[PDB]
Design a protein around this ligand. Structure first.
Ligand code: AS1
Ligand code: AS1
Ligand code: AS1
Ligand code: AS1
Lengths: 448, 449, 450, 448
């Protein structure tokens, strides 16, 4: 026996995290075994009693792993034998580590996903609640990281909330396919003892049962799917982080993170580094790496079970802990950051209203092309005079288009600017208000 | 201006494919602009007529792209001006290339997903039909690419069909989020003219409208998703390809692909190369590469629109054409390959029944650990006598365990072996029939949706 | 029988046509080799080489007509040859396989492309170095966590990107080395069966050496993968420079303005310039990485030797070669034509950024690290309480904090003095920047030669 | 003003403590440079070096106690140093940053690791080449599309993998050289402010040269990326070799059997061995590639200079270093102890595989390529008709097809003669194989 081979093959170091679900799966299997008459009533009692002790050992942190333990399945089996004797061996009857390992992982994932959902909905709720409070705040909207047009700060917050809501929906879709029992698939051909799979389903609380035994022990669709959901969520978080890091620069000055989510030097007490957001942004790569690895692991693999499949667990574990930490830090950052209403409003410039000046002519019937040419001229005329467009005289304006009336004065108002956007989904207050309502309802349906 | 910059920035070369959907998007927008008062009834008639003429030029292949057209959106508006004059310019009022391009890509992807769905469901149907017909065929089931135990050829075919059915379910989920109208989001803050977005939705036949203008124009979730669906689908096909390429070796000898899906030489007329399956398997890399690229493009990008987002189209086009081609070739391969029932059956060996021999004792009350011990003794006994286990004598077996009775001869039958797995999902004939029924019911639902 | 979708998917002619000229060059060399092996006559050789020339010429002019039967470039070029000189043409492929012919084609193509990519990369690096030399006096904030950390020379910023790009150039040279090995003569997988003169082929095609093992030479796509790895790391460097430049071009930072040629805008906001050029560059990091990811997946788990899977290499190489070629030139245009705002870079320098220098001032007078740092922190607090900035504290103010503070301390509050502290090799001190420029010109020279 | 999730997420101590020793070496070299600069007196230096050595030993003995306040390995070492020698410890970080300290620690560790990896890699290559020498007489089928194409020597196959591995070894040397550049003395980003003697730090730490630009030296992770690229392409090679051997080990091919140490089996089927070793190896290509993917995404689009995002480099490097070390050794074991079936390999050789040589026979006689080819096809065609193998055709039968067929055609139908055709450099002919073995031995020598 080669020690390097043994260490490489062995999965106990990390798969012991599945200790509890593994016992849960065995208890369920033991009850079906009895029903199938493989075990006597008394034998069942003994088995279940022993399994409960083991759950407790792991639970209290007293379980002692042994050098011989290849995986969590062998470890639990070894300890039950130690606790109740020979009778423990009837438990693996008609059972394979192949369907046992995917049953364990799916039960762990269903529980993990339930937790991730709570944190994801909390992040969304936090953004939506903040959008509701700061709905009167206006700042520049950007394209190419250049000032485009005024937008409400809440529109920006809600843009991230909406995208995250789609991540929550995908999470639900992933959870559905994970909530399918694979136990009773045996090594690849199914269970040979006509085990009551419906009974196993009910006991382990799965929603339905796997359709084909070969597919059940061979596929890791649920792992890839979860990693795809995870990666896109991180993409969203990498973008929100990017936005917030830039807005927190001294140059932008739109906001400041709380002390808990930033770092800084006593020599420059006014400066705060957004470490929280940089950690979050870098995890998009950490999680994407996991998705890439499993995809490459599964590609070109022959049916059915192959040891290549063992690489699934460490990837799922890393991403579950990554998502759980990242979502809570994101929530914290969003709920505690402080905005500078003053600097956001200060960033609004008259130049950003030339588009609105053109729209003014459009609403009066001037064709789009000529309205844009007119505004461009007003902008040019102001520039030649060394003044801003909101300062041009009505006479100056008419020298370019008699269509400009004294009411053109209303164009140079940033509230009036964002208020143009009443069509559904836009930045006008009535629209932002509607979005908050839709999101509250969406979160409700998702939580449910 | 810099020529190389202009070439790199211009998207006309490929976004040309969006010609029809772009025209369809402008027609719906034109209709809403008229209802909004930006266009007169007559102007709307002139614009829709001109737009219809451009649609025909593209379909007929006579559209003339000018050196000045930077993108499909520009080419179409230029042409509309050539056709109807000045009024053509009012078309873009309140619209932006930002909400126009994602509307175009979504309309295009919605149509492509319908076509892909059709070929995906056809592949699944083909595998299911063959499993129904060849339901008596039995062969080795593998683990570590080593013979593990008997299974029905149909169980193998259905394992691939079940996976593909999950792919079809994901396709639907992706299609749902793609079927959301982004038009009327403007450059980023919304449409400034109170365009009737419900009307645009109904005209373009989208299921609902986008919730937030900034997100509608900035996100490419729908591209990523589609690419994740495509990639997992390809993973499944590369696995089925791996299986069939191996099963097609002369060493395995289980099956032979038709001439249409293989290649060969006259010097060796009996040898066939599965080029079709190798093309398919390598397309998993091709598709995954598009997924990785778009994810990297979006990572770390600030809000809202950035030119980085232009990389979406070539990746979507490639994957759509890869899937449509790959799915039809896969269906072809599955329906036209020829299996060797004789070699598949010859592949089944006695050695593969030692587990069964152990279950035989188990079903008689013998504890798992000791039934396996007894079956082991049996194997060794036959081993030291130069004979296969099914040739071991009744008294021989008895010397090992008295619980071995005359009825043990039924263990040495491969049909009885697979018939052990009647538990839902197993390889027993009844289970296979149930699966066929389940998938058919599943396909019915996915199709009526 | 034949399936239209299958033959369409298997056919590579639509893209492998690009290898037309190099496919013909490899045939001219193999022909010459066949003649030496005694397979062709001196008379035939002249015929064949004469026909290949016409073919080679037809592609060059753009008059070659591909036919429905042409499944790939190898088949197309042969078809036309037979059409040009007759049955004698059919002897050219004697002992040759599409297996060793296609890899020979791709490497010759990549050798030429890499030489072109080298020129562009070296020009980008030279652009950054020469600009650094000219603007060596410009000082602006150095950033960490995108927060102002400390004064640095703008040329130090330019050279940081130049140095990274230099390592990309070095990698390109290593990749080209392995690409510059002849695979022709490996046959289908067991080698050339006619005892062809591989050295003659090497010489004729101008490869540096020949492949050591037939199976490997036929199935490996290492040269494609590392070309792609090199391309991907190069794009990463460019994505970072793009990010910096995009942020520095914001009106918030106001450090620089791209030229109109490499940006977009509207007459409605004439002063605003969108950095489309840099955005295209940043996004191509994804595009190129996607190619590396695809080929690695195509090769993973493949059995020996040739398999049709390998056909996916060509489209990935073509895309990346064309992407780098366009991207590097656009990058060079961006760097050489952008305008910096010395005024704004200078205005971003604040007294608060010298608190670390203030501590260092004490460290050089023997004050321990902890005490000096504490001392500076106290000055920062005193300044704030007094309603001023640290460069405004009086000597008495400073002495009340530490006895080591002497009148010369006023020299700390000078940004040139600040960057001039970093004379240790690699720092932002003017002499260090000068040295780097000289080292980079040297490196470019040696790489240029290599 | 502190958040437990944020703290846990931000600290790197859990994993960067692996850099405990090289961190100490970096501190010792720095301390010496400081003494030379005059920042430390010789006496202070002797006390600092003495404390650093004790910390080095504590880690060596697994006695080092990490405290909850330890954010990273740099912080934990500085804390303990002060506990051991008092205030004097504070002068050590003078003019230094964790920014140039961490990359120095990572390059030192990676240089040591690449040294170990090269040894195992060179040993894997040697294993293949020496086996090829010994089994040089063995012949078996060569495959294209996994279909029998033409006879080749077993040694040609083995050497094909050795040659690819040899390029991996070359890339490793290239990567090591760029890793062997000292970044210490770069400070936070602008360089070292105390005119520290970098050439001295270089000599003490044994780097080949020193970094050229402080910002780049602190910001770049090229060294991490290209080492992950080297590792990923190396894993691709191993995945390819694993695929070949897993297939050759099938009952269906019967070409070889793995030893018990690197295989797994079933008790009811003692003659069957599962190549778990090779599957673990194949799957690791995905695991390593995942690491490559993650770091690329982490770096993509990041602004200069240091960002907390860069913290993700370490876990990826450690995982891959440990993966290659184990994988290379297992691969060596599998190749060294596996047993081939000369009988089965020769058995797989068939007359059908010689039609090609028959055509070559005519071309050497002077028959134009296409004629020789068409003639060979007629030969196989007629053999089939008469329902006999091609080696059974009478010279008469052959002459009717082509006048150029002489009695010596009998030479074509021999497998050794078949492989012997390939004497051109690189071919499978015994002489060509011998030349390869010699070339590879010299290569391995030079790569040292
Ligand atoms: N070892 C095994 N399955 C192990 C599952 C748990 C494993 N650690 C994993 O994570 O995949 N199975 C087989 C083959 C079986 O598939 O028939 C064998 O005994 O070699
Ligand atoms: N050009 C543009 N979006 C173009 C979309 C179509 C493009 N080919 C793509 O594929 O993304 N937008 C802006 C900035 C706007 O976003 O405010 C501009 O005019 O510079
Ligand atoms: N099809 C082939 N080589 C094709 C090379 C060019 C191809 N378009 C590619 O790009 O890989 N070879 C074989 C098998 C040979 O590998 O022995 C055959 O069909 O006979
Ligand atoms: N935290 C930091 N460097 C940390 C290095 C080690 C870290 N665990 C990593 O792995 O990147 N730097 C700064 C900013 C400095 O870069 O100016 C700070 O003190 O906030």
């Amino acid at each position: 026996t080669d020690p390097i081979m043994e260490k490489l093959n062995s999965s106990i170091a990390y798969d012991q995290r599945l200790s509890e679900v593994d016992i849960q799966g065995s208890m369920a299997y033991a009850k079906a075994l009895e029903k199938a008459g493989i075990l006597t009533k008394t034998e069942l009692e003994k088995i279940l009693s022993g399994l409960e002790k083991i759950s407790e050992e792991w639970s209290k942190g007293v379980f002692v792993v042994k050098q011989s333990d290849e995986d969590i399945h062998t470890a639990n089996e070894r300890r039950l034998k130690e606790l109740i004797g020979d009778i423990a061996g009837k438990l693996h009857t008609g059972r394979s580590r192949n369907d046992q390992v995917v049953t364990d992982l799916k039960l762990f994932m269903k529980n993990s996903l339930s937790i991730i959902s709570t944190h994801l909905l909390q992040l969304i709720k936090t953004l939506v609640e903040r959008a509701a409070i700061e709905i009167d705040v206006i700042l520049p909207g950007y394209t190419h990281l250049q000032k485009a047009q005024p937008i409400r700060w809440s529109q920006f917050l809600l843009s991230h909330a909406v995208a995250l809501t789609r991540d929550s929906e995908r999470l639900g879709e992933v959870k559905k396919r994970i909530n399918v029992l694979p136990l009773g698939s045996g090594a690849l051909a199914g269970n040979p003892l006509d085990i009551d799979r419906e009974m196993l389903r009910s006991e382990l609380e799965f929603a339905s049962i796997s359709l084909n035994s070969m597919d059940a022990i061979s596929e890791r669709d649920f792992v890839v799917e979860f990693l795809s959901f995870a990666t896109l969520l991180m993409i969203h978080l990498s973008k929100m982080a990017e936005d917030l890091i830039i807005y927190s620069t001294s140059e932008f000055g739109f906001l400041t993170l709380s002390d808990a989510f930033s770092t800084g030097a006593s020599l420059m007490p006014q400066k705060k580094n957004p470490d929280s957001l940089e950690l979050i942004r870098s995890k998009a790569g950490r999680v994407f790496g996991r998705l890439a690895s499993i995809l490459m692991v599964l590609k070109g693999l022959p049916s059915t079970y192959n040891k290549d499949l063992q690489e699934d667990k460490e990837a799922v574990f890393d991403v579950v802990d990554t998502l759980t930490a990242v979502l809570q830090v994101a929530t914290g950052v969003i709920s505690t950051l402080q905005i500078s209403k003053e600097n956001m409003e200060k960033a609004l410039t008259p130049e950003m209203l030339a588009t609105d000046l053109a729209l003014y002519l459009v609403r009066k019937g001037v064709p789009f092309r000529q309205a844009h040419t007119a505004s461009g001229k007003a902008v040019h005329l102001a520039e030649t005079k060394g003044i801003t467009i909101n300062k041009l005289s009505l006479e100056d304006l008419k020298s370019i288009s008699p269509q400009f009336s004294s009411d053109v004065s209303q164009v140079f108002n940033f509230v009036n600017s964002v208020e143009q956007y009443t069509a559904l989904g836009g930045t006008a207050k009535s629209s932002v208000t509607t979005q908050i309502e839709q999101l509250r309802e969406l979160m409700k349906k998702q939580k449910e």
